[PDB]
Amino acid sequence: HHDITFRNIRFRYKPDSPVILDNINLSIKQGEVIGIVGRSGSGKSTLTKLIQRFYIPENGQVLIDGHDLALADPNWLRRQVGVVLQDNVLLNRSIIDNISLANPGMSVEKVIYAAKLAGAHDFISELREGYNTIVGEQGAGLSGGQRQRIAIARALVNNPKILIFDQATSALDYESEHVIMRNMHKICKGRTVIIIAHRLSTVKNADRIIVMEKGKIVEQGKHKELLSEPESLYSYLYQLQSD
């Protein structure tokens, strides 16, 4: 059983626009943790946009959990996928409102569980106003790494079977980075995970790494296998990011 399948996917953003995704074929097993890497503009983000049916491919199919997304209920699909957004925590609103910003009438309990997996609960619980803390600046003063753990909690709150991490657009403080990496196995447990990675090192221990270039998957495998292809793009990108 594959949780996510792309078959022969062709996609451009607008009728005249350039083909961005060119005959993408991908099958991700349930519970697999996938890293997608590649230069900027290679199509990484577009791939995840298709998973959420934000856009519709001119050719080929996307299937989630067996189901062709053409036919799947858009509300169900929405609940099936949690996305860890970058820089998308509403400042004028409380931590709990921010975490439950999908189903506002859900359990404080479910909010807490998700913050705990995300490694946010401990810092939230030591705030004067706790979960009612208004996230925004002067109202509290949450750091960027703290807001990011809130973003993970948000993605996790409805217990999605698929979790997607959008590419990091920023550097997090060492403590936030540390807590997240320490909790990653708990966050991903029981879910099919896609991580769009800035630094290759981020997805070193993924079950499989997908290497995209100019809208195509050019290489795929575990890190060690990808580095064994002598002239691989993966090796080149790996060398470019080495210290």
Q: Is 166 left (phi over 0), alpha (psi -120 to 50) or beta?
A: beta
Instruction: Establish whether 191 is an annotated binding residue.
Output: no
Beta carbon of residue 129, minimum distance to ligand ADP (angstroms, whole number) = 37
From CA 193, how far away is CA 225, in angstroms rounded?
A: 20
Q: Pick between residue 20 and residue 28 the one whose CB is nearest to ligand ADP.
A: 20
> Which of 8, 29, 41, 171 is in the footprint of ligand ADP by CB under 6 A?
41
Smallest gap from Cβ 237 to ligand ADP, in A, equals 12
- Residue of the chain from 13, 76, 125, 178 that contacts ligand ADP (CB under 6 A): 13
Should residue 44 be labelled a site residue for ligand ADP when binding is judged by CB under 6 A?
Answer: yes
Backbone angles phi, psi at 134, to 5 degrees: -70, 120
Is 50 a binding residue for ligand ADP by CB under 6 A? The answer is no
Q: Cα angle vertex 63, ends 58, 65, to 5°? A: 165
For residue 144, say whether it is annotated as part of any ligand binding site. no
CB count in 10 Å sphere of residue 104:
8
Q: Where does residue 170 rank: exposed (0-12), middle (13-18), buried (19+ CB within 10 A)?
A: exposed
Query: Does residue 24 touch ligand ADP according to CB under 6 A?
Result: no
Instruction: Judge whether 143 is annotated as a binding position.
Output: no
Query: Could you tell me the smallest distance in angstroms from the CB atom of residue 107 to ligand ADP?
Result: 34
Q: Is 145 in the site for ligand ADP (CB under 6 A)?
A: no
Q: Smallest gap, in angstroms, from Cβ of residue 81 to ligand ADP?
A: 17
Query: What are 195's strand-pairing partners?
Result: 35, 165
Stretch that binds ligand ADP, among 39-47, 91-99, 124-132, 182-190 (CB under 6 A): 39-47
Cα–Cα separations (whole angstroms), residue 19 to 25, 39, 56, 58, 100: 15, 17, 13, 10, 37
Using DSSP, state whether 210 is helix, strand or coil: strand
Residues in the annotated binding site for ATP: 38-45
| Site of interaction with ligand ADP (CB under 6 A) | 13, 20, 38, 40-46
